[PDB]
Amino acid sequence: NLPITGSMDTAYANSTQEETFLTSTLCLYYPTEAATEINDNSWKDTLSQLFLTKGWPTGSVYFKEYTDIASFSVDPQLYCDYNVVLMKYDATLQLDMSELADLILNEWLCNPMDITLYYYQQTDEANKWISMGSSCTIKVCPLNTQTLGIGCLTTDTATFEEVATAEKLVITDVVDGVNHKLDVTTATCTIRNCKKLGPRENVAVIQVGGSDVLDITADPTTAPQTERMMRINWKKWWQVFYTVVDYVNQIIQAMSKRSRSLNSAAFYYRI
């Protein structure tokens, strides 16, 4: 990172939309019920051809399917330079979808949490505990200066304070500056101590139906809707995919390249 000095009189460059479409890949994530309702084995090819009419080279648009929000939330792997997630809305899963957004609309620096040997605390507002798995039942027992417990007994997991049960993904926020004993089903869950670094620009979430319920910030005083959180009313999935294809330029405009230097192990779909 170095200072960047620019003149306010500099001329605008031509549109780079065509160049980025030519030299980037687009990943579309949709629920399996979308494929069920569409009921066509060539719809991938049709959407690819329509995107080609929009400008994307053949094969640059990758279509990925997930069973549901809960299953998709188990360590989601986003591959393309631009990722669009068509997330179905359910009034009963308002938190879960929000959690999913909070995991894919932001960059996270995570480290392992071996709770059996250590008692953990959250140092600042950015620190959270992200637990992912098939079944994540997390119980919390805040401790005292002698590491014994407040309203809870370290030995008796029954007296612990229940913060999650049977979850595929949960973001846990406890009071900062307090050590907690954690009881999680490590067999079917992995919990990580994570710091949110900032927005993840290459991931957009389009909520299919419902209202604005997403809250990607644990702070109760803020519920900010970034440009990457879209919401469309729907009755047919073909219309949903057609509006995604037609306004692809608008969707990408709301997104930017990731720009983060990572250290993790995830595959990517790049050109």
């Binding site: 306010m8 500099t10 780079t16």
Partner: protein, 396 residues
């Protein structure tokens, strides 16, 4: 130059003082000087023009002297004087125009037109008399190698530059820290912006600095400093540094903190003002250092607390601005300013006659280029042409 100025001054005094009914006692010395000018100029052939569209003109001087036995001037005397005055004024104007359109690199201070070079001979020094104007006074001081001085109201010392620097930036341009400035003429508006409002700053303080180097040393400068930069206090879409994209600026203005304006000469602090606004004096300086701070308000009302969240998105971007305006100054070199018209005169004469671009000045006499690369040769040529322009302004 001194001879040309003396010709112009004699002609101006003849126009002003040779009037109907005036006592000859009011013009006796002036009439003697005028007759001396006639005697010196008689029998001399001059040629002006021949550059650009300025026409070639030949000047012959064979004139009779003015009378000296009158008690009060009458109409006949005034018309007889006015014929010669008109011819001489036309000659001086053409010589001034011919000199204003020429330039040299090595010896730009010396006369360029053949007419002025001829007038620089010894025999013409008889025409020389009172040199009282500021520009001719400075010309004579420079020729004697004495200290020179020009007073400028709102000196045009800062070349136009509307730029910015981003000390913290991302491709999406949503968490930006930096400073944007306009330097124009005698005005410097600077504004340091933090999108995060210095929430993550060490002491909740963000330090902003702006160093402006003046191409010439300014002395006895009166400056007005104000704590806001209105130019950068409204929302705007700004191009990127490379021009590839554009970003959004949505200022919310907070008073600047720990304001410190330093006026430096050769890197040494000559003047310093901390948390001082209004009129200040910079006695001698060539650089300005404006260092200010954005301090996060420790206590916020619910609206203010709503403006600045703990993390992104940052929709309202904290900004602290400074405005610096040099109202008057003194410089040893010639500069364009708001009150004078020498730059306008020289540019007008060059434009009207389609003078081809020379090897010294920028095309079209553009001031931003001239002051950006204000080299000693350019200073010499500019002083010469400005003195000629003032001499011409005495008459035309």
């Amino acid at each position: 130059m001194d001879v040309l100025y003396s010709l112009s001054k004699t002609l101006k005094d003849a126009r002003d003082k040779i009037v109907e009914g005036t006592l000859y006692s009011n013009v006796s010395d002036l009439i003697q000087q005028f007759n001396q000018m006639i005697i010196t100029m008689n029998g001399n052939e001059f040629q002006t023009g021949g550059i650009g569209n300025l026409p070639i003109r030949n000047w012959n001087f064979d004139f009779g002297l003015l009378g000296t036995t009158l008690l009060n001037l009458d109409a006949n005397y005034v018309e007889t004087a006015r014929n010669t005055i008109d011819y001489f004024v036309d000659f001086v104007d053409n010589v001034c125009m011919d000199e204003m359109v020429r330039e040299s690199q090595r010896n730009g201070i010396a006369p360029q037109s053949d007419s002025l070079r001829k007038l620089s001979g010894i025999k013409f020094k008889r025409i020389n008399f009172d040199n009282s104007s500021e520009y001719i006074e400075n010309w004579n001081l420079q020729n004697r190698r004495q200290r020179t001085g020009f007073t400028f109201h709102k000196p045009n010392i800062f070349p136009y530059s509307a730029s910015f620097t981003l000390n913290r930036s991302q491709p999406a341009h949503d968490n930006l820290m930096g400073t944007m400035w306009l330097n124009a003429g005698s005005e410097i508006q600077v504004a340091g912006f933090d999108y995060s409002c210095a929430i993550n700053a060490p002491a909740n303080i963000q330090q902003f600095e702006h160093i402006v180097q003046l191409r010439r040393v300014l002395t006895t400068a009166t400056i007005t400093l104000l704590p806001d930069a209105e130019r950068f206090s409204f929302p705007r879409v700004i191009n990127s540094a490379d021009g590839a994209t554009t970003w959004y600026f949505n200022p919310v203005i907070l008073r600047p903190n720990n304001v410190e304006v330093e006026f430096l000469l050769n890197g040494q602090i000559i003047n310093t003002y901390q948390a001082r606004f209004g009129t200040i004096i910079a006695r001698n300086f060539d650089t300005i250092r404006l260092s200010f701070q954005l301090m996060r308000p420790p206590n916020m009302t619910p609206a203010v607390a709503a403006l600045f969240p703990n993390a992104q998105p940052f929709e309202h971007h904290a900004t602290v601005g400074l405005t610096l305006r040099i109202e008057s100054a003194v410089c040893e070199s010639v500069l364009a300013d708001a009150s004078k018209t020498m730059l306008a005169n020289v540019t007008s004469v060059r434009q009207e006659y389609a003078i081809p671009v020379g090897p010294v000045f920028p095309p079209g006499m553009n001031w931003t280029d001239l002051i950006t690369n204000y080299s000693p040769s350019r200073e010499d040529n500019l002083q010469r042409v400005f003195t000629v322009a003032s001499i011409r302004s005495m008459l035309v």
